[PDB]
Ligand binder design. Structure first.
Ligand SMILES: OC[C@H]1O[C@H](O[C@H]2[C@H](O)[C@@H](O)[C@@H](O)O[C@@H]2CO)[C@H](O)[C@@H](O)[C@@H]1O
Ligand SMILES: OC[C@H]1O[C@H](O[C@H]2[C@H](O)[C@@H](O)[C@@H](O)O[C@@H]2CO)[C@H](O)[C@@H](O)[C@@H]1O
Lengths: 399, 399
């Protein structure tokens, strides 16, 4: 099924897969082990479909939120980095890759969405969501729009939904209560209603996706976009004069983006687990390896202390971490797949006008929530506290 | 050594030891086992001395702060209640009696100090410490005084010392740094200076102890005192019309009392551990058992949910919990002994004029601070997070 003496890697197509392929080439040059990097469509859905019967890649990269589900299904090898290696990465990042108390992936970098704006069109970007409609009116008369971002993935709309009170699964006292979903409270309704009204009032199009928003911003047709570190390098090439800053407030509250830790897991069925460990620990998670990936598409705030110290002075990373501090770490519980699936459908149905905000979010609450909560082991409860600790996250924040 | 076929219990003399002896009589009726309740002076210092020689009581009652030291020293038997019993008490109270992964006592009640005032002498209690001098001046002209409280035990002066920034051990990210004490910072100096100034300006006396303050308040000789729930029954008998309220603010900041969980530990040297467990679970931690103790001297907010629901109606308990929310849970680390010794010494020396506030607190820092910072095991780091969770604690104060 999976080939012995070689490595296959899956990583998302928005990441620096060519940079990662360069790291694979250095690995092959030094060790003779071929590394093949692929970026399949819907890889986060395909992985569980293929790993169950011993197929799929040796190493899978994704934000940490999906890994709990994968671990629960028996798809991931427990990783065993030694103490000396663990000490090289920020503790917070290790805490984000624990499931049932075991380390189930190597953390790579911390991601959060920021407001990206065209400094020539918009020297003083808006501090609030409320002022965007008027900004869009002014710009439309000059042949431009105010804001375009991916409306097809709920990750991008979440910061606005969470701003005034929306939440996924209630986190409290080291545990996530899967009975208690906050996608249909007053805050979530207010946030999604604001988005839907932007669309009704012709300030945004319900069909806008990642590629459309990126092309619009990068060609100078829209003054702002919402995106993560990975997007910066294409903007660099476009020569649009851009800034990266704090997301706008809504009802006076900060936007609250979900925080992701890009992570690399090892397939439980891989016969190359030690080659995977060697590649990840000794090639990728080095200054040189991370630089290779980062130069392709920026990673955000990297888990490796030594390299983060170099990246810390970048204002764009400062903005990323400011937005992250205002947001919250994604849960990694197996119920996250159902949550994302339910919220994606609700946002698209409401933005399209097929459903009211209230009906869409009521359905999403029902479909995301479990009927009753379950047990959390002590080592995991500790991990949960640690990823909710500002002082723990602060080790990276100050860099 | 400890006598087999009998239970000796130690409890502090301010508590309901006669009520506890009544629970003992019921135990004796059912089991044939005589229960002797004693209330030795400075029992929290005597226990570790006598228990280290295999002597002492079968069961020791004290606030949870001293129990980490006792457990570390090997003086306490591990508690293993079954899930059915555990579910009867608030989780937070169990979390307070964990030490390095083991339950080392049965929790009984949550204690915090409050401001107690004579409503006939003082209908409107002061919101600030700063207004007490002027208040004392008016009352001295009427043959009374404003405030008397125990200045001999640092437990009672700590809320003022901590108000403007004083702290015991620096607490961050689930861990205490025992090298970093806050008994000699600007906030601690300000608080102790204010107390010492009250004495210098003849608004308080340095020799005022527990007995002097209680007698003066209950005989109507002074207008206010500072004390815990246990004191309310003697005030009831005195017929003084009293209120229990929030502690005064200092420099605009809440007074921060240390919160204690009265707990019952089993002596590791006891040959009666199974009897002691049965006494505690099946006789004391019942509605009827806690009622007997509480009717003698109030316990505070009890750990037993069924009885706390019955006591939550009392405004004096609400006040106790408001003060606790403003304060901090006591650490249970072994170094707490040295901390209390250090602050006890400083307050007495400053109040007597034996040393200046600065010199006393300089010595306290040296006496309280460890030479190095020990590790924190993962189990205790978790318990630390749990006892600092406002949602965890909130389950009680909602009652
Ligand atoms: O939209 C739901 C989606 O959100 C997150 O995915 C992000 C990912 O974390 C970023 O690295 C990036 O590639 O954009 C994605 C959104 O398109 C969750 O990680 C994911 O599981 C979820 O389905
Ligand atoms: O004053 C230092 C002393 O403070 C605490 O003791 C309290 C105790 O918690 C209450 O239950 C009560 O009886 O009043 C005591 C003060 O007299 C700490 O628990 C203790 O270890 C410390 O020595």
């Amino acid at each position: 099924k999976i080939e012995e003496g070689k490595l296959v890697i899956w990583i998302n197509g928005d990441k620096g897969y060519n940079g990662l392929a360069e790291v694979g080439k250095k690995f092959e040059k030094d060790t003779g082990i071929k590394v093949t990097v692929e970026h399949p469509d819907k890889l986060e859905e395909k992985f569980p479909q293929v790993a169950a019967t011993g197929d799929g890649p040796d190493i899978i990269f994704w934000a940490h939120d999906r890994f709990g589900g994968y671990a629960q299904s028996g798809l991931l090898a427990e990783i065993t980095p030694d103490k000396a290696f663990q000490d090289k990465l920020y503790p917070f990042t290790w805490d984000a890759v624990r499931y049932n108390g075991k380390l189930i992936a190597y953390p790579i970098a911390v991601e959060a969405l920021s407001l990206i704006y065209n400094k020539d069109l918009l020297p003083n970007p808006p501090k609030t969501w409320e002022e965007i409609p008027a900004l869009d009116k002014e710009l439309k008369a000059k042949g431009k729009s105010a804001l375009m971002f991916n409306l097809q993935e709920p990750y991008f709309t979440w910061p606005l939904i969470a701003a005034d009170g929306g939440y996924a699964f209630k986190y409290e006292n080291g545990k996530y209560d899967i009975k208690d979903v906050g996608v249909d409270n007053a805050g979530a309704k207010a946030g999604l209603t604001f988005l839907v009204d932007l669309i009704k009032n012709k300030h945004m199009n319900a069909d806008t996706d990642y590629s459309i928003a990126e092309a619009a911003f990068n060609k100078g047709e829209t003054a702002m976009t919402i995106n993560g570190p990975w997007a910066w390098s294409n903007i660099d090439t476009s020569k649009v004069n851009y800034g990266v800053t704090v997301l706008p407030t809504f009802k006076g509250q900060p936007s609250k983006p979900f925080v992701g830790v890009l992570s690399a897991g090892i397939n439980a069925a891989s016969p190359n687990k030690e080659l995977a460990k060697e590649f990840l620990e000794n090639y990728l998670l080095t200054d040189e390896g991370l630089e290779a990936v980062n130069k392709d598409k920026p990673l955000g705030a990297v888990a490796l202390k030594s390299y983060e110290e170099e990246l810390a002075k970048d204002p764009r990373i400062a903005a990323t971490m400011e937005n992250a501090q205002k947001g919250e770490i994604m849960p990694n519980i197996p119920q996250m797949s159902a949550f994302w699936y339910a919220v994606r459908t609700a946002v698209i149905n409401a933005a399209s006008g097929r459903q009211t905000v209230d009906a869409a979010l009521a359905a999403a609450q029902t479909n995301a929530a479990a009927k009753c909560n379950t047990a959390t082991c002590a080592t995991q409860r500790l991990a949960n506290f640690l990823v909710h600790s500002s002082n723990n996250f602060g080790a990276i924040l100050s860099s």
